[PDB]
Design a protein around this ligand. Structure first.
Ligand code: BMP
Ligand code: BMP
Lengths: 217, 218
């Protein structure tokens, strides 16, 4: 996946007008947008096609799929029918639940991103201790796309070691949560940035600033 | 705790509005509590919650297995309750802060949170099972009153009930299609969640009636 400027916009605004306006203001800096439930549950799944029609950007559906196999299949099918190019799936629920997603993705020509360790403090309670094994599970399952925490560079580095240089890795927690753009890109192929951009007084300048700080990357 | 008619909750996972409405309407006399998840919501929109409320006199549990960071969890819960959901199901594995975020919104908005501890599918044994007892204990410490546990593992469901106490409300999926037995599950759960056994039956109403007949003494 070729992500422009190694920067993925996490569009979590919950108003269609604002989401479209802000995304449009930074369209020259990105070509990949992560759309999650905050926007989808507020404006509907039709928003995905709207983004593709207006920006032609690739869309990653951040739905952190975490159900049983049967339900995961249905969620992925509904998501790809809406036009999403990829979907993010939790690995904690096990291999069968991930495989269900991989199957639908293959059938519809899409990609599955496996979320290993999360970026928030609570991730230390249960997820962190299982993260390395979740990553190895992804490798065993043939997963090629992963999500790891910008807030813990040492953990992000370990994830990269496990999946190898050929795998694709994206990382959230940059900016608002404390992660550094440049440091994160030492291990991740692309950084995910939400609030630092969409809540900034000038989203365009915010995006431009982040890119300037990693221009050598 | 919510008064679930016949201790039976319908897992409405059909993805077609017409079929979902037809089947739910056919079993309306047996169930007053419906669990709506992403298969239906992502196919028909959040307005489906509004339509179910209008068409049926049913309580709605939004099975969204919320599993994000605190900030995003808050937004998901707000949008879900704004749509009319009486309660929302949240994953406990992402940690205490993520669960607390949901509890805070539920408190502010006058709704309820259900904490999913262990899951019913085979894959749950890989990582969730080993953390389930602690996730449940965490829920108790956080003040969680509603929980979700697996019917497919009676021994685990029994332990979960012990951890949360008799006062807590516990609902359990995995009955029917996944192998769980209605009666045995109700030994520990306040209500059973049933999907395919009912919505894929030639006569959903007869399927629901049959399940209820088997647990009549309970
Ligand atoms: O571990 C993870 C996984 C995520 O997808 N995310 C998501 O990435 C985005 C981060 O946004 P922000 O830059 O505003 O903190 C959110 O949409 C969030 O749900 C995260 O923050 N941590
Ligand atoms: O551990 C769990 C948690 C669930 O919510 N569920 C949900 O409960 C329902 C079970 O449906 P069914 O009776 O068709 O197997 C589904 O909507 C599923 O997503 C489950 O099966 N196991």
């Amino acid at each position: 996946m070729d992500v422009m400027n190694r920067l993925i916009l996490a569009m979590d605004l919950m108003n269609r007008d604002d989401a479209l306006r802000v995304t449009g203001e930074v369209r020259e800096y990105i070509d990949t947008v992560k759309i999650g439930y905050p926007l989808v549950l507020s404006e509907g799944m039709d928003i995905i096609a709207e983004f593709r029609k207006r920006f032609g950007c690739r869309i990653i559906a951040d739905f952190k799929v975490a159900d049983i196999p049967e339900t995961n299949e249905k969620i992925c099918r509904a998501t790809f029918k809406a036009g999403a190019d990829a979907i993010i799936v939790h690995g904690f629920p096990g291999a069968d639940s991930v495989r269900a997603c991989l199957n639908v993705a293959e059938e519809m020509g899409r990609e599955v991103f496996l979320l290993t360790e999360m970026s928030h403090p609570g991730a230390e309670m249960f997820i962190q201790g299982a993260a390395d094994e979740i990553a190895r599970m992804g490798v065993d399952l043939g997963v090629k796309n992963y999500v790891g925490p910008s807030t813990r560079p040492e953990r992000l580095s370990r994830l990269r070691e496990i999946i190898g240089q050929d795998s694709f890795l994206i990382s959230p927690g940059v900016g608002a949560q404390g992660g550094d753009p440049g440091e994160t890109l030492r291990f991740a192929d692309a950084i995910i940035v939400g609030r630092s951009i969409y809540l900034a007084d000038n989203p365009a300048a915010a995006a431009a600033g982040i890119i300037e700080s990693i221009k050598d990357l």
